[PDB]
From a paper:
To provide structural details of the [name]/Bcl-xL interaction, the crystal structure of a deletion variant of Bcl-xL (Bcl-xLΔ27–81ΔTM) in complex with TCTP11–31 has been solved and refined at 2.1 Å. This crystal structure revealed that upon binding to Bcl-xL, the residues 16–27 of TCTP11–31 completely refold into a 3 turn α-helix conformation that binds to the [name]-binding pocket of Bcl-xL, a hydrophobic groove created by helices α2-α5 of Bcl-xL. In unbound TCTP17, this N-terminal region stabilizes the β-sheet hydrophobic core of the entire [name] protein. This suggests that the interaction between the full size Bcl-xL and [name] proteins induces a substantial reorganization of the known [name] fold. The main difference in the binding of [name] to the Bcl-xL groove as compared to other high affinity [name] proteins such as Bax is the absence of the first turn of the helix, located just before the canonical h1 (P1) motif which is non-conserved in [name]. The side chain of the hydrophobic residues at the h2 (P2, I20), h3 (P3, I23) and h4 (P4, L27) positions form a network of van der Waals interactions with the Bcl-xL groove. Three additional residues, I17, L29 and the side chain of K19 participate in this hydrophobic packing. Of note, since the canonical h1 (P1) is missing in [name], I17 might counterbalance this absence by packing with the hydrophobic residues F97, Y101, F105, L108, V126, V141, F146 and Y195 of Bcl-xL in the target-binding pocket formed by helices α2-α5. Furthermore several hydrogen bonds and two salt bridge interactions contribute to the recognition process: (i) R21 of [name] [name] domain interacts with E129 and D133 in Bcl-xL; and (ii) D25, part of the (Gly/Ala)-Asp motif between the h3 (P3) and h4 (P4) positions of [name] domain, interacts with R139 in Bcl-xL.
Translationally Controlled Tumor Protein ([name]/[name]) is a regulator of pluripotency, the cancer stem cell compartment, the tumor reversion program, tumor progression and certain forms of inflammatory diseases. [name] is a major anti-apoptotic protein that exerts its activity on one side by direct binding to Bcl2 family members Mcl1 and Bcl-xL111213 and on the other side by engaging into a reciprocal negative feedback loop with p535. Altogether our results demonstrate that [name] contains a non-canonical but functional [name]-domain that binds to -and unexpectedly activates- the anti-apoptotic function of Bcl-xL. By using extensive biochemical and biophysical studies we show that [name] forms heterotetrameric complexes with Bcl-xL via crucial interactions between the N-Terminal region of [name] (TCTP11–31) and the [name] binding groove of Bcl-xL.
Residue numbers in the entry:
A (entry chain H), C (entry chain G), D (entry chain E): 11 to 31
B (entry chain F): 11 to 30
E (entry chain C): 15 to 29
F (entry chain D): 14 to 29
G (entry chain A): 0 to 26, 83 to 208
H (entry chain B): 1 to 26, 83 to 207
Write the structure that this text describes.
Amino acid sequence: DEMFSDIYKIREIADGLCLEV
Amino acid sequence: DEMFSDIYKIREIADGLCLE
Amino acid sequence: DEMFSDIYKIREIADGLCLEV
Amino acid sequence: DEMFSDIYKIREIADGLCLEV
Amino acid sequence: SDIYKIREIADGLCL
Amino acid sequence: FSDIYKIREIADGLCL
Amino acid sequence: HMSQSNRELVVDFLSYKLSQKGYSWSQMAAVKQALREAGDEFELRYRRAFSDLTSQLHITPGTAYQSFEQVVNELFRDGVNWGRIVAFFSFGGALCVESVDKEMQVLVSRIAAWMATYLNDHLEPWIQENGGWDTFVELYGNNAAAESRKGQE
Amino acid sequence: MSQSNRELVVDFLSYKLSQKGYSWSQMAAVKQALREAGDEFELRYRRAFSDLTSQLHITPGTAYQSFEQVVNELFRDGVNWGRIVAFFSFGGALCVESVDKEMQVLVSRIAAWMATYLNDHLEPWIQENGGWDTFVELYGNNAAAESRKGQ
Ligand code: NA
Ligand code: NA
């Protein structure tokens, strides 16, 4: 299963780009 | 080190990491 | 203006990720 | 060095650089 | 030893 | 904040 | 009014910088950088033991996937480890360089798809049972493989 | 299927192809050059004086002025590539300080400020001086670091 599910969650939440830290 | 403490919700994490 | 207009064009053309070469 | 020449068009480049998802 | 060479370097890269 | 002239000096020395 | 690239360049640099200083959340940035460093180290070791990786690579459009599958299957023939996973990425990159060099640039996104598919179907389960990408970062992050190499010469 | 698997592969291949010399959009080349130039600037600064983030100090309400204050001070004499690199490193330093002081909410704001300043006040100079393409040719392949290590 997706091991970086959290970063994809915040990407849809936001309108634009998110830091990948 | 963890950038966010366990108290942070994913909503505020998005606010801090994402533009606009 | 946008100096990387080409990469943003192929990104919209495509439905998936594009290489940034 | 140039990966593509003037020959290639934007959709041909998109097909080669971008994934079908 | 094409793939052997890759496997050798790979296994040597193990930490 | 006078460290900015320090930042600027290192920045200019970085120029190629 | 605003060039999108100005946002993208800033976000990339800050992601790179924050991860470099030790901070992490999703660890996406850390994994990418660790893979970049590990790939370079693998190719450095391979090239200093044999010839360059891209030196002998034969590819045609009709047999590209077939050849890719055979090599990768022999690589993980008797198992998976972090070193072989790194080798997997390096081989794919080498395959792409040869594709472009032979004017078969269109194969680049194909090779990318095959890699992602194999990574997802055959490598991901092993990774999950071996500490996840988190373990890879802990072991290979901060150019640990390179540091190991010549803490030794 | 995990999209992260796609993202990991695409990033690696972009890095590798650009590293081996191939280019089209040069997006990967510019990003990598900035990463390298940033590291080199911070190295030189840390040897010359203290580390960059050591002396910074901000609050959410006082974050913005402390940004524009430093940045406009950096570019009053004019613009060059070295200063543009320093601009990125300072922004990074500001974010490190923010996270260290648990003001992570400032990170995306600092990022927005940088993008805005870069777009409004730096991009015109960049386009008149050869664009990012010239930056890549001058600072690509860890050039600034190689210049130093030669001595
Ligand atoms: Na936000
Ligand atoms: Na990216």
